[PDB]
Write a structure and sequence with these properties.
The structure is a homodimer. Chain A is of the alpha/beta class. In chain A, 42% of the residues lie in helices and 14% in strands. The complex binds pentane-3,4-diol-5-phosphate (2 copies), cobalt (II) ion (2 copies), magnesium ion (2 copies) and nickel (II) ion (6 copies). Chains A, B: Belongs to the SorC transcriptional regulatory family.
């Protein structure tokens, strides 16, 4: 038995967080953890979002589970914006559109989509694509967002970001060796530093340093497979609110 | 009363078509015509598509109605590919994804999406985007397609292609004055000639001259608002199969 409050305050002081929410999940398996964290993430969002908020959302399996658990809230003037594009160049679907739809619906608004892949083949195309005024507006809304909600990814073989046709096998091998994970599809190492300036320069979406400026940058993540990823993310100070299970919390404190 | 067979053979000889299918629609209103043409289009597709076919589909209100009326067919080895991207930069939705999903489902396959807008801000970005190998593959499948299904659009104020954030007001004014319509979002005049090489050079999707090479290039269109558009399309020889109502057929013969 962990005093979840004790673990929370330890994480808060260790990583300089505004809030650490240690959620009880009875078993250490990833599915079970994720389910419990997604549930509390949805409750936290419902409690937190208020009139006039600009809310940035990520995508992926965690974010879709949170979305699926969202319940409506009577708020006015809320904007919900996609923080990174979710277009795939493979048959694999990110469900980014469905995820943001569910969040926007909860908050009585319509989704502000970012209708792009997150990674492009080269920095020249990225720079030409990002200059489209519609894209610029969406990226600027992502910067304005006072609330950002995301997870951290892994570099496992079946990592979603390795299945979307973005990367060649040399790049995947590099990331598997040199990154611990991604936030919004930007890859960092164990110290939170950007792994590859070249790959980062091919990416359209919220910049990691911009997350540090927000009223709430909320990281929802847990499981043994994400311990190192979370540690990197927190070391980089990319989130000020952490929603985590007690197994993973203990692993980080230890 | 029109002998629909007589009108058909007249259109066939007038425009050098492989097939003209004159569909009876009792009233001249656009909704009524479109419904009847969409229904027969779905039946024609069901009858026509066979094992191994590569089928290219367009999008828009006509194409979505056809899609909604499609019934399944037990065929093997069929590919269904999007002929032009359907991403919008406004809140207006083309339903391109839902349209191709319904066609692919009918033909026992999964959609080959073109995850792009059809028009880009400038020719430089278009050229850089089209070089992505995934995009190249989809465009090449569109060229390989032995069956292409499309409508022709108008240049009315509420034309779908004027509502997607592609064009500034100067460009819309130019197109309204100088084009009669579009096939797959490429604009032509009354003689079937491309209106603007500049706008055409900003467009990713099936090239009009490539439609002329296919076993079946199927144009489904009717209504007084599309008479001039259809005439331009047929004058350019972009379709070898026409599905049209008897009101519009009479207007073209007259
Ligand atoms: C946007 C990509 C996510 O950061 C991550 O790689 C995948 O999310 P899940 O781990 O929740 O699938
Ligand atoms: C892909 C655009 C279509 O050619 C056309 O502009 C619109 O289709 P509907 O006329 O069927 O809406
Ligand atoms: Co190899
Ligand atoms: Co004006
Ligand atoms: Mg549980
Ligand atoms: Mg009818
Ligand atoms: Ni409430
Ligand atoms: Ni450390
Ligand atoms: Ni444990
Ligand atoms: Ni049949
Ligand atoms: Ni003529
Ligand atoms: Ni009539």
């Amino acid at each position: 038995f962990e005093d979840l409050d004790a673990l929370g305050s330890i994480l808060e002081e260790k990583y300089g967080l505004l809030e650490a929410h240690v959620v009880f999940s009875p078993t250490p398996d990833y599915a079970g953890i994720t389910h419990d964290l997604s549930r509390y993430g949805a409750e936290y969002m419902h409690e937190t979002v208020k009139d006039g908020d600009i809310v940035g959302v990520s995508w992926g399996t965690t974010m879709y589970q949170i979305a699926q658990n969202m319940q409506p809230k009577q708020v006015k003037g809320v904007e919900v914006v996609q923080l990174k594009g979710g277009i795939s160049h493979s048959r694999v679907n990110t469900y980014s559109a469905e995820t943001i739809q569910l969040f926007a619906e909860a908050f009585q608004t319509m989704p502000r989509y970012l209708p792009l892949p997150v990674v492009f083949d080269n920095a020249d195309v990225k720079r030409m694509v990002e200059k489209d005024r519609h894209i610029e507006r969406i990226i600027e809304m992502g910067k304005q967002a006072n609330i950002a909600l995301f997870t951290v990814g892994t570099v496992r073989d079946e990592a979603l970001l390795f299945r979307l046709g973005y990367f060649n096998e040399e790049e995947k091998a590099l990331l598997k060796k040199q990154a611990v994970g991604d936030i919004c599809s930007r890859f960092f190492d164990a110290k939170g530093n950007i792994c590859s300036s070249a790959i980062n320069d091919r990416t359209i979406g919220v910049e990691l340093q911009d997350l540090r400026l927000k009223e709430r940058s909320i990281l929802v993540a847990g499981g043994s497979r994400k311990v190192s990823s979370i540690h990197g993310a927190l070391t980089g100070k990319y989130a000020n609110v952490l929603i985590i299970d007690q197994h993973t919390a203990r692993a980080l404190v230890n």
